[PDB]
């Protein structure tokens, strides 16, 4: 999840309806369960992301057919297919999980 600005659980998990609704209730209840952990910290977290440590600390992201610009948080990165942003690890973590960024 998914990740900035989560901001809702949607379009994820290609299994969707094919997987049993009994599990999906558990699932939605579970991400609802983790929203509270998100709400205790005050880290900030971003717990969902950054399993792999920052270096260093600016990277280069090459657009991958994404539109864009949807980068509202922090700044309007103005997403544009065939455009690489010499941007800090910060918004890279959040945006790479979605599927916009490609090369770290």
């Amino acid at each position: 999840n998914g990740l900035d600005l989560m901001s809702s659980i949607t379009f994820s998990q290609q299994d969707t309806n094919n997987l049993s609704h009994q599990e999906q209730e558990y699932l939605k209840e579970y991400c609802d369960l983790i929203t509270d952990l998100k709400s205790g910290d005050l880290v900030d977290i971003d717990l969902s992301g950054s399993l792999v440590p920052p270096s260093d600390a600016f990277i280069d992201v090459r657009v991958l057919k994404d539109a864009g610009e949807i980068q509202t948080e922090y700044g309007v990165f103005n997403l544009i297919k065939d455009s690489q942003f010499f941007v800090q690890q910060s918004d890279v973590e959040r945006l790479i999980q979605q599927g916009y960024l490609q090369l770290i």
Binding site: Q22, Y26, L33, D36, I45, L47, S50
Partner: protein, 221 residues
């Protein structure tokens, strides 16, 4: 009490955590003073970053430094607790049986975080609720309770104290436990005779024989 030391202890805790087969006490005294400290510097850097634009009709370095640092240490604890929550996910039952029993130390406000306890009970709840409307309907009368039969078993597992963990022996010498020839500590495995332990050399053994050394932090993992 120094920041650097709280950090060294943070790292120490982090390693000891990812190594050991089982859960460790929740170190609130430190982890909370860091959870206050980062709330301080994250506000401070945004304040100095915003005040910096006023002298602007210079050097971004201490700001970049600072910020990178904060990314690193905000990673560290996030690995920590993201790990512990997993071991809670695996030990939920064991912990439950540990809670219903009197002796010795149950979850309380200590063994788990005031944040973690919520995660534990809610996960446990929604899990039981999942399996309940899924496969127990259709409920065996003996199998109503989730606990030992015994056998096999279930869970119970895994407070596994015999698992191997790489350990590196470090701690202040008085010249407590040093019996020679090089140094501390005992050892005394139950199945075997002492090696015993040498301090400049890492020696892999069971987690149980060393748990007390772990408590004292006389051996890193």
């Amino acid at each position: 009490v120094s920041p650097q030391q709280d950090f060294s202890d943070l790292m120490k805790s982090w390693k000891n955590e990812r190594c050991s087969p089982e859960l460790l006490p929740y170190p609130h005294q430190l982890m909370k003073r860091l959870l206050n400290r980062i709330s301080m510097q994250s506000q401070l850097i945004e304040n100095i970053s915003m005040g910096f634009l006023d002298m602007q009709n210079e050097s971004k370095l201490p700001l970049l430094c600072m910020e990178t640092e904060l990314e690193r240490l905000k990673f560290v604890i996030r690995s920590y607790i993201r790990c512990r929550l997993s071991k809670i996910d695996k030990f939920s039952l064991y912990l439950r049986q540990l809670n219903e029993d009197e002796n010795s130390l149950i979850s309380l406000t200590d063994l788990l975080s005031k944040d973690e306890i919520k995660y534990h009970d809610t996960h446990s709840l929604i899990w039981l609720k999942l399996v309940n409307d899924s496969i127990l309907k259709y409920m065996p009368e003996e199998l109503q309770a989730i606990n030992d039969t015994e056998g096999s078993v279930n869970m119970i597992d895994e407070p596994d104290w015999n698992k191997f963990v790489f350990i590196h022996v470090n701690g202040p010498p008085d010249g407590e436990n040093e019996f020679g020839k090089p140094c501390y500590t005992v050892t005394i495995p139950d199945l075997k005779e002492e090696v015993e332990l040498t301090i400049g050399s890492i020696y892999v053994m069971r987690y149980e024989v060393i748990r007390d050394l772990l408590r004292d932090d006389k051996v890193a993992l």
